[PDB]
């Protein structure tokens, strides 16, 4: 299947990404608390529902929320300010809260059932969010021996997510809170996000020498994100 691309709402970030985030890929955004990772997730969960000529994929959303940070009111705001019906946009976002990392892993299997259910509808799943990908793994796998064990479990979880992305033509979007680099990562594309002044945010592609080497700049607004 040919890949698809979901606009982020920022022309600058879209150019950095070659048009938007890709299906059949895992895009990881990482950065400090408050950098805007979850704002980008909320924005994508609306943008994906737009028709293709407007930068969406007419798609539904699966959202695995590990920090109780999904906000339907934020979806509503973004949708209304983009000309969309907030209640209809919310209808096509299917959210589960992950209690711990083992539940988070099982939820990926449950996600496949929802993906299959919607595959032949007019709004197949096109976006799968895991926010936060790493928070439960960080709290549970800690101390001597944990680096190897945590990395193995996280790699297996990411492999399961890669399979859904690739088998069902879905863009997987995951968030990871960092601080202040030595660990392996298996996402397709890694985007470092940081906060500038007020509502301004700066994005850079990490370890992607074949792709744009500049930086995108965008603002958090009532439309989600915009230039």
């Amino acid at each position: 299947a040919t890949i698809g691309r979901i606009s982020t709402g920022s022309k600058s970030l879209d150019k950095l990404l070659g048009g938007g985030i890709e299906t059949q890929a895992i895009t990881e955004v990482f950065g400090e608390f408050g950098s805007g990772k979850t704002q980008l997730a909320h924005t994508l969960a609306v943008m994906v529902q737009l028709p293709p000529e407007e930068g969406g994929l007419n798609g539904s959303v699966i959202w695995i929320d590990t920090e109780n940070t999904f906000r339907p009111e934020r979806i509503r705001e973004i949708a209304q300010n983009r000309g969309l019906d907030p209640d209809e946009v919310l209808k096509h976002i299917y959210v589960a809260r992950a209690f711990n990392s083992n539940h988070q892993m099982l939820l990926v299997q449950q996600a496949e059932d929802k993906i299959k259910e919607l595959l032949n509808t007019d709004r197949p799943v096109k976006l799968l969010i895991v926010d936060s990908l790493t928070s439960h793994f960080r709290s549970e796998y800690i101390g001597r021996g944990a680096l190897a064990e945590r990395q193995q479990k996280l790699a297996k979880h990411l492999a399961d997510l890669h399979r859904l992305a690739n088998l069902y033509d879905i863009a997987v979007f995951v968030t990871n809170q960092v601080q202040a680099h030595i660990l392996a990562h298996s996402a397709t594309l890694r985007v470092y996000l940081r906060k500038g002044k007020g509502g301004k945010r700066i994005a850079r592609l990490i370890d992607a020498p074949h792709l744009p080497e500049g930086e995108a700049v965008f603002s958090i607004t009532e439309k989600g994100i915009e230039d």
Binding site: I62, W63, F70, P72, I75, L90, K91, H92, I93, Y94, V95, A96, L107, Q110, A111, K114
Partner: peptide, 4 residues
């Protein structure tokens, strides 16, 4: 999962 549950619809929002």
């Amino acid at each position: 999962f549950a619809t929002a």
